[PDB]
Amino acid sequence: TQVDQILRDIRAVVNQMVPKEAKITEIEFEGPELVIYVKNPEELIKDLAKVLKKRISVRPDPEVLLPPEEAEKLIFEIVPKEAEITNIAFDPSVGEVLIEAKKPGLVIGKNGETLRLITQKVKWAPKVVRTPPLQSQTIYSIRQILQTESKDRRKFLRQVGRNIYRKPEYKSRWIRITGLGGFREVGRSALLVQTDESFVLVDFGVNVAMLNDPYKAFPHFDAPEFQYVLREGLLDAIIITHAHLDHCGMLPYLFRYNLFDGPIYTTPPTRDLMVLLQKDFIEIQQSNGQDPLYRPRDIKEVIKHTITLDYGEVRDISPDIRLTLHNAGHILGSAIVHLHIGNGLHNIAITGDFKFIPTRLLEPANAKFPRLETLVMESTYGGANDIQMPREEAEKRLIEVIHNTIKRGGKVLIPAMAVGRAQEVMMVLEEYARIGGIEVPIYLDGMIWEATAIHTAYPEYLSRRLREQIFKEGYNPFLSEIFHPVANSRERQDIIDSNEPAIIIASSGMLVGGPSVEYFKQLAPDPKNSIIFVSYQAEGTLGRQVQSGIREIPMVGEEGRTEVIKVNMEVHTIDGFSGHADRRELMNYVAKVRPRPERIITVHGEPQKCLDLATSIHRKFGISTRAPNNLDTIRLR
RNA sequence: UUUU
Ligand SMILES: [Zn+2]
Ligand SMILES: [Zn+2]
Numbered sequence: 001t002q003v004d005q006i007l008r009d010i011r012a013v014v015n016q017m018v019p020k021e022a023k024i025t026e027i028e029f030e031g032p033e034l035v036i037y038v039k040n041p042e043e044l045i046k047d048l049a050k051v052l053k054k055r056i057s058v059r060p061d062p063e064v065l066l067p068p069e070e071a072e073k074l075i076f077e078i079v080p081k082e083a084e085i086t087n088i089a090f091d092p093s094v095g096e097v098l099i100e101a102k103k104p105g106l107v108i109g110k111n112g113e114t115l116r117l118i119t120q121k122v123k124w125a126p127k128v129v130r131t132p133p134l135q136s137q138t139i140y141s142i143r144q145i146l147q148t149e150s151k152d153r154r155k156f157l158r159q160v161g162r163n164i165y166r167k168p169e170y171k172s173r174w175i176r177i178t179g180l181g182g183f184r185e186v187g188r189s190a191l192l193v194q195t196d197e198s199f200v201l202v203d204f205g206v207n208v209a210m211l212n213d214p215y216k217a218f219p220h221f222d223a224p225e226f227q228y229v230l231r232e233g234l235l236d237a238i239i240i241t242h243a244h245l246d247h248c249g250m251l252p253y254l255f256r257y258n259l260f261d262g263p264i265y266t267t268p269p270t271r272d273l274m275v276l277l278q279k280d281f282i283e284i285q286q287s288n289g290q291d292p293l294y295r296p297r298d299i300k301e302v303i304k305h306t307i308t309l310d311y312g313e314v315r316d317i318s319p320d321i322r323l324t325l326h327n328a329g330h331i332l333g334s335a336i337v338h339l340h341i342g343n344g345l346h347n348i349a350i351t352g353d354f355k356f357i358p359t360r361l362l363e364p365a366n367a368k369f370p371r372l373e374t375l376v377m378e379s380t381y382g383g384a385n386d387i388q389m390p391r392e393e394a395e396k397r398l399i400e401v402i403h404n405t406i407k408r409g410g411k412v413l414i415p416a417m418a419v420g421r422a423q424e425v426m427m428v429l430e431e432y433a434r435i436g437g438i439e440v441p442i443y444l445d446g447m448i449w450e451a452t453a454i455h456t457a458y459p460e461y462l463s464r465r466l467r468e469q470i471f472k473e474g475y476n477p478f479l480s481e482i483f484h485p486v487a488n489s490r491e492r493q494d495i496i497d498s499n500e501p502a503i504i505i506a507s508s509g510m511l512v513g514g515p516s517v518e519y520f521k522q523l524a525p526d527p528k529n530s531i532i533f534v535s536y537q538a539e540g541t542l543g544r545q546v547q548s549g550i551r552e553i554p555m556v557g558e559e560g561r562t563e564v565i566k567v568n569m570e571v572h573t574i575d576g577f578s579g580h581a582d583r584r585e586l587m588n589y590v591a592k593v594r595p596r597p598e599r600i601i602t603v604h605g606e607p608q609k610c611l612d613l614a615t616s617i618h619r620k621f622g623i624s625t626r627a628p629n630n631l632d633t634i635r636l637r
Numbered sequence: 638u639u640u641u
Binding site for chain 2: 043044045046047048049050051052053054055056057169314315316322324340341342343344345346347370371
């Protein structure tokens with residue numbers, strides 16, 4: 001490394017554009033950003049940063065700070081006690097106190113004055129928030145881990161920084177991308193980006209549809225290049241497109257075996273959401289009497305290593321790679337990953353899963369980038385006939401099936417992952433509720449409610465409409481008194497036994513595990529009940545099996561004896577709520593993406609589909625395309 | 638409050 005050698009030049013230009021009265025105590029690197037500590041308060045920053053080509057954060061010296069047990073009631077006083085301040089956390093690792101007030105306007109300073117007045121008394125960065133409608137165990141837990149681990153996090157960030165700046169901006173000699181999983185297949189997405197100077201992992205999923213076979217369930221750990229990057233400790237960073245297990249599922253496995261301790265970049269909502277899905281994942285395994293892939297301490301490590309980034313925020317993550325995340329419109333926090341390699345040498349955009357039309361919760365994926373030579377895109381519906389049903393026709397079909405089900409005295413089972421389709425279908429029923437249509441109750445089972453809480457904590461990540469409809473008003477469609485969160489194992493049993501028709505939405509989305517499987521098993525026989533698939537059912541899942549028509553499904557239970565569930569209930573498939581761009585959308589994304597890429601690489605789709613989309617794009621746009629296999633490596637330059 |  002030669003970082004402090006570089007800081008020696010940074011410090012020579014910083015202490016050259018700011019009054020010595022600022023008594024600059026220290027200037028170090030914290031993750032991507034540069035930290036300039038000073039022992040005194042107070043347009044300059046904007047200039048300092050535009051010159052240094054970095055993200056600078058200037059805070060008071062960590063010495064002029066007050067303990068969280070003394071600076072708590074010291075602030076609670078210097079604030080108009082009207083704005084109900086539900087909570088008030090502490091972040092000493094970055095000097096910044098969080099004021100989770102119910103009324104932010106009366107706590108920040110009616111005239112932007114109670115902003116600096118308050119900070120003084122304790123010398124902590126005053127940041128106001130609006131007590132979200134729902135409380136999240138997950139968010140609270142993360143906050144707990146971050147504040148009670150300030151020591152490590154500080155150590156970790158300083159290291160990452162010395163790493164990211166082990167040398168000045170570099171122009172790479174070559175660039176290659178290798179598929180470790182998720183190429184010509186759905187699941188276990190994992191793409192390794194290489195240059196002669198760096199290595200970054202884009203996603204690292206698992207395929208729950210096949211944990212039975214680790215060679216089909218995990219990314220290729222058996223790739224020479226990947227083993228070489230892990231063992232030598234050369235992985236600069238891991239980036240996650242979105243929270244689903246098939247993109248971040250194996251991430252904690254990495255810590256369980258001490259294979260990595262570098263930074264993980266992702267949007268805040270994805271950090272919170274993935275942590276949720278991971279705990280949910282190991283617990284479902286255990287409830288099944290199976291040894292879990294990892295444990296809470298491992299997930300605790302993920303948290304401790306994650307460096308969040310909001311959309312549009314450009315950050316240097318290595319000497320020759322610059323990251324920027326953009327909206328993918330797939331699920332809360334979903335991002336298209338953009339890599340600016342070299343200083344104008346080459347640019348890659350990895351799509352992850354994306355939707356290119358509006359939905360209740362999100363806006364179509366970003367299709368504009370400053371530069372874009374190579375585009376890696378998903379192909380879940382890459383087939384030529386993979387046109388999803390129009391959103392409104394689906395919506396109407398969903399209400400239809402429910403009526404023809406409630407009428408004949410039955411229940412409607414809607415399997416869906418805690419994150420994604422669940423909230424989308426919720427909205428559909430919630431708007432339909434406000435106009436008199438939701439008679440029977442709607443039960444949410446499987447951490448779907450916990451996930452819904454996280455949504456309400458991130459209004460800025462939802463569509464502008466749903467966003468304003470959140471904080472600006474005292475309204476919230478998620479709070480709707482029409483959803484009844486299934487509290488425990490018992491309540492679940494009651495619901496099943498009861499005779500009151502009802503709508504049941506529960507994870508997992510593919511009947512691969514969790515609350516959804518119990519309902520399935522118990523409702524299958526009765527033809528009064530109905531099951532509606534509103535998500536892609538992957539090959540190898542009990543879901544696709546049921547969705548395919550199989551009427552007698554063998555299932556292995558305890559003490560090794562198999563069970564044969566008799567499927568009589570009605571089987572319906574409504575794909576119009578999909579979080580995936582359909583065939584038309586994918587093609588249309590290519591047409592609109594700008595700048596037009598030199599080459600497109602189709603991935604994340606059944607083999608035929610990746611092939612089909614790739615062949616189709618080339619034929620219609622004349623763009624160089626390819627549908628690589630895992631372990632294929634494409635030299636981009 | 639960095640860039641091609
Ligand atoms: Zn997904
Ligand atoms: Zn996926």
